[PDB]
Structure formats: C-alpha cells, structure tokens
Symmetry: C2
Subunit: 143 residues, 2 copies
C-alpha cells in the first residue's frame, strides 16, 4: 500500500504523491492525507484554516475528498466504487461530510447534498457511487 499526507502552510501549496495516493494542502491549519493500493486511487485536497481531507481506498476503489475552509471531508472506497466528498465552510460555517463505498452497501448509488447556514453535516453510502456535498456558510440564525 501507499500513504500520503500534506500539512498546509500559508501562501503555498504542499503536495505529496506516493503511487496512487495524492495529498495536497494549502494554508496553515489545513491537513490532507490518504491511503491507497496499486489498483485503487486516493486523492485528498485541503485548503484553508480548519480544512481536513482524508481519502482511503482499497481494491479498485476511488476515494476523493476536497475540504475548503472550516470543513472536514472523509471518503472511503473499500474494495470497489467511487466515494467523493466535497465539504466547504465559509464565514464561520462548519461543514462535515463523509462518503463510503462497499459491495455490501444497501443502494448502488447514493447522493447527498446539504447546503445551509452554520454547522452542516452529510453522509452517503453506496456500492458503486457515493457522493456527498456539504456547504456551510455563516451561522445558524438565532431565534
């Protein structure tokens, strides 16, 4: 197997490519990492303070994570499938997402898209294509 990681630094990108594992981080407080195997692909990209991207894959899975701002994205493509998580947190909004694929999952395809203020979370699970997109902006209004 392969593993890769990048610690973000202000004013540049940092990239680490090891085999089929690609990690890239931009900005202090960002962290990107992954693990993969020769037949699989993991790509993790983190940008900005509070961004964490984590991609794990095995077999013939493809795991992709993109975290921008105050956001966490975790994708696990375990044996097969395409697990893609995009989490974006802006102006105080915190976004957390995950996507997992496995031959054992309930549905062949599952797509979850969650957009709103303040803290937002989303998850997906599928055999073949699990896509999670979570976008958080500003704070939840107070009532």
């Amino acid at each position: 197997g392969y593993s890769c990681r990048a610690v973000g630094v202000d004013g540049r990108a940092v990239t680490d490519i090891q085999g089929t594992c690609h990690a890239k981080a931009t900005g202090a407080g960002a962290m990107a990492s992954g693990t993969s195997e020769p037949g699989s692909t993991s790509t993790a990209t983190a940008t900005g303070r509070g961004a964490t991207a984590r991609s794990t894959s095995t077999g013939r899975g493809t795991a992709t994570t993109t975290a921008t701002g105050t956001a966490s994205a975790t994708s696990n493509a375990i044996g097969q499938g395409t697990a893609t998580t995009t989490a974006t947190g802006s102006a105080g909004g915190r976004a957390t997402g995950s996507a997992t694929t496995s031959s054992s999952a309930s549905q062949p395809t599952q797509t979850q898209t969650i957009t709103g203020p303040g803290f937002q979370t989303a998850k997906s699970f599928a055999r073949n294509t699990a896509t999670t997109t979570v976008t958080a902006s500003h704070h939840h209004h107070h009532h």
Copy 2:
C-alpha cells in the same frame, strides 16, 4: 431518457424528480437542471441568486452538480464515469466549474480544485472519475 428542471423562488425549495434525474433549486435566481437515462444518474442542486447547476448523464454515468451563490457547476458523465462539480461563490466573486467523463479521455481520473477571490474557474476531464471544486470569495 429523462429531463428535470427546478427554477428557484423565494420562500420554499423547488424540486423536480423525473426518473433518474433529480433537480433542486432554493431561492429566486437559482436554477438546477439535468438529463439522464435509465442506467445513469443526474443530480443538480442550486442555492441562492445566481446559482446554476446542470447535470447531463448517459449510459451508466453519474453526474452531480452543486452551485451555491454566484456560481455555475456543470457535470457531463457521458456513457460512463462519475463527474462531480461543486461551485461556491460569495457576492463580489464568481465560481465556474465543470467536470466531464468519457471513454475518449486520456487519464482515468482527474481532480481540480481552485480557491480565491473574484472570478475563479476550473475544469476536469477523465475516463472514470472527474471531480471539480471551485470556491470564489470576495
């Protein structure tokens, strides 16, 4: 085939589900649309004034688009593959992205991510997995 479209209004989300085509738009000035086939999946979500999401899929492709704010996201999963685009634009900025899959591409996977102020654009193209994320601030 199937086609779907949701044109946003103020005060409620608009959803249009037609077969394997799912469109959702929230807010006046938002629009989501797509086209798909029985073996494919298209999902398009747009939120806020100036957000446009368009997902086209055929064969066994999966096309997903999410546009938030001043943003355009377009995904084309033609015949095969997973094409995912997320575009987020603050007022004063604009984010434009596309992701395309096709057996005609040279690489099996491609990921593109761009973040910055003002006008930002990114595009990806691959055989199996194309992912694009564009975040524009002001």
